Each structure stands twice: as structure tokens, then as C-alpha cells.
Amino acid sequence: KTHVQLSLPVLQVRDVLVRGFGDSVEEVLSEARQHLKDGTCGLVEVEKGVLPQLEQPYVFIKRSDAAPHGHVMVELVAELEGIQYGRSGETLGVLVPHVGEIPVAYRKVLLRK
């Protein structure tokens, strides 16, 4: 399928143990997509002071359209030293590996895959 319904655990930035997906734009997008498929991807909501506590390159989920079955349609955009790779809508959050951190909420998304 071109889209997959996912429910992403929303993590507090100070709980996150693995603060990024890797070392290049291509690697972080690759790893983000693998973790999304494997159910091992969390979401951190972006506010003042969050991104400097995480590792670049960043992988964002961004709203791709204006929401089937409660699931917002999203796509991935990476960022490294202020340059984004991809073009999309509003940020829903930054993706990180999930390694068993307790979430505060779930974010239902339809991921363009």
C-alpha cells in the first residue's frame, strides 16, 4: 500500500534514549522508514528547546494533505544544518527510535510509504 495507518507513541524529549536515527540525511530517512514499518518509532512534539536536545539530522513528520479514519496523512522531511530534504506541510513532530520509553499520548497518522 502507498499509505499505512500507524499509531505513534508520543515521547517526552527528556525520556528519549536514542536521540536520532543516524549520521546522514539519507540514513535518517532510511532508518525512520524502517522503524515506522517495525513499530519501533516514537514522535516528539516540537516546542522551544526540544530540537537542540535531539541529534541532527532530524526526521520530521509533516502534514501532507487536509484525515482518513482519524489518521492525519503525513510524509517524512529530513533537516541538516538548516536545509530540509523534502517539502510538505505543518510539522506534527520529530521522529526518534522507540526503545520502550513510556509515551504521554498516541498520534494516529497515515504515512505516505
Side-chain angles (χ1 to χ4, degrees), residues 14-28:
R14 290 182 184 282
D15 286 339
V16 171
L17 298 181
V18 184
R19 285 180 181 267
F21 281 116
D23 300 330
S24 70
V25 161
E26 291 160 84
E27 184 179 18
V28 298

Side-chain angles (χ1 to χ4, degrees), residues 12-80:
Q12 306 198 313
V13 67
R14 290 182 184 282
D15 286 339
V16 171
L17 298 181
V18 184
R19 285 180 181 267
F21 281 116
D23 300 330
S24 70
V25 161
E26 291 160 84
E27 184 179 18
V28 298
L29 288 165
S30 182
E31 283 293 327
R33 291 192 165 94
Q34 193 65 50
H35 280 81
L36 286 160
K37 176 230 167 113
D38 297 344
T40 57
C41 192
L43 180 63
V44 181
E45 293 189 320
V46 179
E47 285 187 340
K48 294 301 194 294
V50 168
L51 284 175
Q53 291 185 75
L54 298 173
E55 292 171 340
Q56 294 193 51
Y58 310 126
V59 174
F60 302 106
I61 48 152
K62 282 182 167 299
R63 190 196 214 92
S64 62
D65 181 22
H69 313 267
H71 294 249
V72 173
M73 287 184 50
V74 297
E75 60 202 336
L76 304 192
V77 174
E79 178 179 312
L80 178 56

